[PDB]
Amino acid sequence: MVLYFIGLGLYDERDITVKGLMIAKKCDYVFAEFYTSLMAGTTLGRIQKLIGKEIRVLSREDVELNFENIVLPLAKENDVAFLTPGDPLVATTHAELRIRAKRAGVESYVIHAPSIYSAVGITGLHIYKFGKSATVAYPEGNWFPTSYYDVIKENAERGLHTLLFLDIKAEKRMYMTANEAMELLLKVEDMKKGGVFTDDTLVVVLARAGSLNPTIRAGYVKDLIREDFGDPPHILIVPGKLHIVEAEYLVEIAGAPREILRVNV
Amino acid sequence: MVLYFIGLGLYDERDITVKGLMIAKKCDYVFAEFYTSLMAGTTLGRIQKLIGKEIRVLSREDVELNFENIVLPLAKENDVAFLTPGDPLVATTHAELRIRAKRAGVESYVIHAPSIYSAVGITGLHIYKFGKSATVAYPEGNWFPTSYYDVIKENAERGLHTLLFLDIKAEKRMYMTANEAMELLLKVEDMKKGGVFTDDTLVVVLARAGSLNPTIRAGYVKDLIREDFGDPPHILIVPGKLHIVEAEYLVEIAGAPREILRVNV
Ligand SMILES: Nc1ncnc2c1ncn2[C@@H]1O[C@H](CSCC[C@H](N)C(=O)O)[C@@H](O)[C@H]1O
């Protein structure tokens, strides 16, 4: 009679932690959502096969409006698990569902998994140098989001890197590429003209983190905006000013132009 | 011909991912380091039993000064695994190890696991709101470092949270406690009088993230600086202005005082 929030990891069913697998195997009911992120290297079937249960997938509305009607009831009796891509609380509002659990007299526990937030370390950029993060959202009708642009400006001021989560509309199977995010930003720069993001800005693209062969690329926008980085998910990072070893890693591992070697301290 | 950087996760031997453990079981050689952090919820013996491979442990010098003469040679004619607590490449100096491997003509792959950078999402604080990160270090001799203090100032200044790693003397197994970190910062405040950290500052303490029963506590320094948060390791977080939903979580989950619903929002 408790509820488990269990992360599934970055790419496939194997990025779950052993702790999560053995507990998931012993739960009576298993729920999940696949709208907060995209696990490009697996299927619901493989997850079900690995865990040895039938996973009922929930929609954003089932979760955000009916979590306490669909999932919480069974927890008061049974052991229930709620699976999510990556880490269950990172760049989601699932944390709030812990509070709902509490108000219904249900104990909840969290089992972490590898998250895109810490996986940026594979880019060679010191993770402690990351500043405030932001999400590049798809424009809707007449409304064109731009806050993420200011975030980059603020962090870059301070010499900090900026992590940009990319938008996703899972029900429509839409996953914003880095390419797409770079376009929106040029438009925003063109609209605000702050010299934040231009054809000469250095950016880093990390695609399908968690797989064994993720795409990691660093370079100027003019060069990258049209390059193919493979299937989603992608994220895009706008570094601040670089340490020498960061630049060496970017050149050596991420194929950046050798001349970012030359840092302008 | 292959080197696997495999993360061990947060607290115990089960915090490794299923992908990590299977890859490790198939490696001819397995190395690990416990100088950047320790796994307080387990032992080297229980890690070795779960992997079924003897684990040779490397010191900080072994890694930083002789990675290429201890680990890479073996990786040229065998599959080698290098285990680190948390997520691989989070520790500032580790990414550069991949360059060494490239230089030695060795292929390297990274197998992610849970990191404290993402696992603090369990505190209910929004991840995108975290700013620059820092480490609280012990003063010693004629040296009294205070950069971590300025970090908190610049972050809180911008409404961003500050994640503070506490000093650890890995070899001597000697952890700075959240209590000690608080007093240090109180002492640093008396020095710079910047109005950054005082008895009225609200802070969040996270201990043994990853275990099923972590300790999550939030409150004003004057009430926490002398509270017992249990066994290490401890992580300190000085939040910026809170989103009402964050505050509710800290109150309902981390036992924070009602007062924050109106004072820190
Ligand atoms: N493996 C991966 N590679 C690249 N980007 C990823 C990724 N997994 C998630 N993302 C990024 O993050 C967005 C989802 S945000 C939710 C993140 C999740 N809780 C976690 O802990 O990772 C995606 O739209 C994408 O931009």
From Swiss-Prot, chains A, B:
S-adenosyl-L-methionine binds at residues 10, 87, 90, 115-116, 166, 209, 234. InterPro entries: 4pyrrol_Mease, 4pyrrol_Methylase_sf, 4pyrrole_Mease_sub1, 4pyrrole_Mease_sub2, Dphthn_synthase. Coiled coil: none annotated. Keywords: Methyltransferase, S-adenosyl-L-methionine, Transferase. Homodimer. S-adenosyl-L-methionine-dependent methyltransferase that catalyzes the trimethylation of the amino group of the modified target histidine residue in translation elongation factor 2 (EF-2), to form an intermediate called diphthine. The three successive methylation reactions represent the second step of diphthamide biosynthesis. This is Diphthine synthase. It comes from Pyrococcus horikoshii (strain ATCC 700860 / DSM 12428 / JCM 9974 / NBRC 100139 / OT-3).
